[PDB]
């Protein structure tokens, strides 16, 4: 893992030049196309995409477990709607799932710590069955955390292997939008009030008892803020180190990851913690409908391309930007130049 | 043309209704897929739809002509390169015609008054070669602006027979987006000053000169805010006539138009004017970089999907946002259903 971290590659600036110039002869004037041209850059500086902006495979990884925090009444979305949804993923009907087909990506699905019998076809990875209230104590160990990084940051990195160019990352678990409040928090020392949300569409009453058990994981876990494993750990979940791991393995083999929501920024601070030389590889893709979105994303420095007042979750506002991705790949590509049409500006 | 605006449908209250149920019994928390769900809901209103959101051909119409403001200095562009950008359509590898074959639509170039020789391959609908300098006088006259009107419109409709369900509205005009601001500024009573923008890299020193054309503009025409058509004619252009045009034909044909940047709002503030009826068939794209944006879509009251600090034109931004209406289509479609699920929430 420190290896892991460790051998994360910067980003090349040699071919990001060559991509600039490039762009910059394209048949239009100079700057139009916008942050079109900023991510084409991008793209060209990732390792793995070998000097150019380009997309190969897709997918999204679909991150699964339950919270004991569900407990303390914090979410009116039955428990077992988890698992339910899981096994949802793989017959293809759910939100995320049709996103994807839309946009030509694999879908993966992983339980990472579903608080139920395993469920045939998706990727098992469950380091327990749902994860420790943060309310009164500590979603899980340390070593648990580690561990589940690896794991997940290596599975990432092989798919990479099969030909995925893009990943998308996603969640699925019942009440976490309070470990996901706890860590925005946390990481940007802004209170609980100010970041937490209605998540899937807690009543306004309840809202204030969500704001306390906040408060209470904070107060009684004192995570670390300067140690992203240890906040995570602390007052995360196993569905929160999961996306973290994606974010590891995809910057770690040189590639380019597609955040979604709320819950995927709260697991981008934790990556920045705990890597900043993961930052170049992450790309917005919306601006979610969490109270909380607009701090979390102004920690990351990010701006997100589509505002869709979405709060769904599971990966569907990455599936919906990847189109946006490809729509650079081909500017790149496939423009004609000034040049060629004798067109000269000043 | 009394009879064309008069016979715009309105939308379908009935369908409407039948889709929002739907939507709510999908695989999600109620609302929770935000935009999404109101453009399902829209479309489904829309009469040529057939009742339900769906895309079948798309087409993005590329409006080209010249003016003769060019002559005032207010564009660095040479005014040859909108002949030149017009010959590039009917190659594909404008900026444009690389979105929409990314997004699977057909683009049709048509030239309304491009001062050149007539270029093979492109629809000729030529009104005059580049229209009248509006520093000076009107652009053209309301007869000439009227027949436009009616041609576009009827060759909208007509495409709309060929499959065609969802149209873009783009342009391309050397010196456009001068005659663009002052309609915002005729329209939404706003000061040249505050709705003048760079446009095609024009110098920061030159702006002033720009705002002065504009205002003289508007002094020596006198247009009438209150009639759409006084305005285009006077301050307008040929190409701003024609996606008027093809706004009023999709909504006469009961289907959607996807708008593009700044040139496109000003003709949307126009068509909207000019009939009310048009409305709800209009669709955003993106938030244009250009100065006068924000203004001119707080007086359509639209917020658009995508943040891309595009100022291209072209169409480009209507054929970036094609998938995401598709997008809307596929989840009124293919998601599956809580009830099926056994899922059950408050
Ligand atoms: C120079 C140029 C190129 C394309 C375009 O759409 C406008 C101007
Ligand atoms: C009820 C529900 C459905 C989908 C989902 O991702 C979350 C909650």
Not at 84 to 106: D, E, F, S, W, Y
Not at 239 to 251: C, K, P, Q, R, S
């Amino acid at each position: 893992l420190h290896a892991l971290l460790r051998d994360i590659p910067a980003p090349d600036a040699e071919a990001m030049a060559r991509t600039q110039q490039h762009i910059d002869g394209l048949l239009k004037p100079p700057g139009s196309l916008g942050r079109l041209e900023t991510l084409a850059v991008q793209l060209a500086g990732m390792p793995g995409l070998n000097g150019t902006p380009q997309v190969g495979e897709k997918a999204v990884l679909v991150m699964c477990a339950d919270h004991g925090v569900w407990d303390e009444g914090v979410a009116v979305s039955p428990k077992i709607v988890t698992a339910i949804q899981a096994a949802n993923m793989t017959r293809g009907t759910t939100g995320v799932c049709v996103l994807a087909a839309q946009a030509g990506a694999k879908v993966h699905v992983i339980d990472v710590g579903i608080d139920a019998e395993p469920i045939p076809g998706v990727v098992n990875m469950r380091v327990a069955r749902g994860c420790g209230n943060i309310a009164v104590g500590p979603a899980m160990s340390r070593l648990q955390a580690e561990a589940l990084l690896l794991e997940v940051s290596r599975y990432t990195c092989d798919l990479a292997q099969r030909g995925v160019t893009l990943f998308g990352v996603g969640e699925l678990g019942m009440a976490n939008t309070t470990p996901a409040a706890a860590m925005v928090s946390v990481f940007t020392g802004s209170d609980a009030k100010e970041v937490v949300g209605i998540g899937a569409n807690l009543p306004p009453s309840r809202i204030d008892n969500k704001v306390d058990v906040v408060r209470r994981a904070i107060a009684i876990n004192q995570p670390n803020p300067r140690d992203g494993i240890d906040v995570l750990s602390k007052v995360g979940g196993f569905d929160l180190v999961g996306m973290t791991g994606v974010m590891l393995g995809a910057a770690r083999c040189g590639l380019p990851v597609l955040l979604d929501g709320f819950l995927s920024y709260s697991a981008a601070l934790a990556a920045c913690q705990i890597a900043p030389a993961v930052r170049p590889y992450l790309i917005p893709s919306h601006f979610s409908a969490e109270k909380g979105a607009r701090i979390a994303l102004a920690h990351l420095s990010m701006e997100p391309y589509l505002h869709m007042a979405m709060r769904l979750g599971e990966g569907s506002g990455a599936a919906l930007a990847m189109p946006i991705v490809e729509a650079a790949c081909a500017m790149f590509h496939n423009m004609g130049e000034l040049a060629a049409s004798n067109i000269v500006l000043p």
